[PDB]
Amino acid sequence: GYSLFQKEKMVLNEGTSGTA
């Protein structure tokens, strides 16, 4: 499932592991 395995990965990349 996309909004399951990637649901939580989308959280890590947008905040701490990215920073725009």
mmCIF file of N, CA and C in Angstrom:
data_model
loop_
_atom_site.group_PDB
_atom_site.id
_atom_site.type_symbol
_atom_site.label_atom_id
_atom_site.label_comp_id
_atom_site.label_asym_id
_atom_site.label_seq_id
_atom_site.Cartn_x
_atom_site.Cartn_y
_atom_site.Cartn_z
ATOM 1 N N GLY A 1 0.814 -1.236 0.000
ATOM 2 C CA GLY A 1 0.000 0.000 0.000
ATOM 3 C C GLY A 1 0.849 1.289 0.000
ATOM 4 N N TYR A 2 0.473 2.254 -0.863
ATOM 5 C CA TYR A 2 1.171 3.560 -0.978
ATOM 6 C C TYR A 2 0.981 4.475 0.281
ATOM 7 N N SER A 3 -0.257 4.665 0.805
ATOM 8 C CA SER A 3 -0.500 5.459 2.031
ATOM 9 C C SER A 3 -0.491 4.464 3.235
ATOM 10 N N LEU A 4 0.734 3.964 3.489
ATOM 11 C CA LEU A 4 1.066 2.934 4.496
ATOM 12 C C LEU A 4 2.609 2.889 4.658
ATOM 13 N N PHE A 5 3.331 2.207 3.749
ATOM 14 C CA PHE A 5 4.807 2.141 3.713
ATOM 15 C C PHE A 5 5.408 3.538 3.376
ATOM 16 N N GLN A 6 4.887 4.205 2.322
ATOM 17 C CA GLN A 6 5.229 5.601 1.990
ATOM 18 C C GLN A 6 4.482 6.662 2.858
ATOM 19 N N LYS A 7 3.392 6.322 3.605
ATOM 20 C CA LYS A 7 2.684 7.282 4.493
ATOM 21 C C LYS A 7 3.652 7.966 5.516
ATOM 22 N N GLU A 8 4.408 7.132 6.254
ATOM 23 C CA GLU A 8 5.444 7.528 7.211
ATOM 24 C C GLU A 8 6.780 8.043 6.594
ATOM 25 N N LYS A 9 7.219 7.533 5.419
ATOM 26 C CA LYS A 9 8.427 8.025 4.709
ATOM 27 C C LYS A 9 8.323 9.482 4.181
ATOM 28 N N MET A 10 7.139 9.853 3.662
ATOM 29 C CA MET A 10 6.764 11.239 3.321
ATOM 30 C C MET A 10 6.951 12.248 4.513
ATOM 31 N N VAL A 11 6.753 11.788 5.778
ATOM 32 C CA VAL A 11 6.948 12.595 7.009
ATOM 33 C C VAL A 11 8.459 12.913 7.267
ATOM 34 N N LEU A 12 9.325 11.878 7.289
ATOM 35 C CA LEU A 12 10.793 12.018 7.478
ATOM 36 C C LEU A 12 11.514 12.942 6.447
ATOM 37 N N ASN A 13 11.247 12.746 5.139
ATOM 38 C CA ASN A 13 11.852 13.543 4.043
ATOM 39 C C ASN A 13 11.442 15.050 4.028
ATOM 40 N N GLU A 14 10.140 15.375 4.174
ATOM 41 C CA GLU A 14 9.645 16.776 4.224
ATOM 42 C C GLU A 14 10.162 17.639 5.425
ATOM 43 N N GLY A 15 10.357 17.031 6.613
ATOM 44 C CA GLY A 15 10.832 17.741 7.819
ATOM 45 C C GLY A 15 12.362 17.715 7.996
ATOM 46 N N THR A 16 12.863 16.721 8.751
ATOM 47 C CA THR A 16 14.313 16.583 9.081
ATOM 48 C C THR A 16 15.285 16.218 7.911
ATOM 49 N N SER A 17 14.936 15.231 7.067
ATOM 50 C CA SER A 17 15.798 14.768 5.941
ATOM 51 C C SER A 17 15.441 15.460 4.587
ATOM 52 N N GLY A 18 15.632 16.789 4.532
ATOM 53 C CA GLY A 18 15.338 17.594 3.328
ATOM 54 C C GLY A 18 15.591 19.085 3.599
ATOM 55 N N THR A 19 14.665 19.721 4.349
ATOM 56 C CA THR A 19 14.740 21.153 4.781
ATOM 57 C C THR A 19 14.798 22.161 3.587
ATOM 58 N N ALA A 20 13.625 22.664 3.155
ATOM 59 C CA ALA A 20 13.518 23.629 2.031
ATOM 60 C C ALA A 20 13.463 25.083 2.566
#
